[PDB]
């Protein structure tokens, strides 16, 4: 478990490792926005 003073952030931390996957998905939103140019 985290140190008590950061306890507040437990659910944020359960989610952070997934964030680099979101950058891959973001590349396809961007390409959809410009029409796969």
């Amino acid at each position: 478990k985290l140190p008590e003073a950061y306890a507040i952030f437990d659910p944020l931390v359960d989610v952070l490792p997934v964030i680099p996957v979101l950058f891959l998905a973001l590349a396809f939103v961007w390409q959809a926005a410009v029409g796969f140019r």
């Binding site: 659910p11 989610v15 979101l22 926005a33």
Partner: peptide, 27 residues
């Protein structure tokens, strides 16, 4: 909730594309 934050976080990205496509930006 966990599902609260992964929402604030999941929306960050598509938010950036919207703000830039509306402000006709360098996409």
């Amino acid at each position: 909730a966990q599902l609260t934050m992964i929402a604030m976080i999941g929306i960050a990205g598509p938010m950036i594309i919207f703000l830039l496509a509306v402000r006709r930006g360098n996409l």
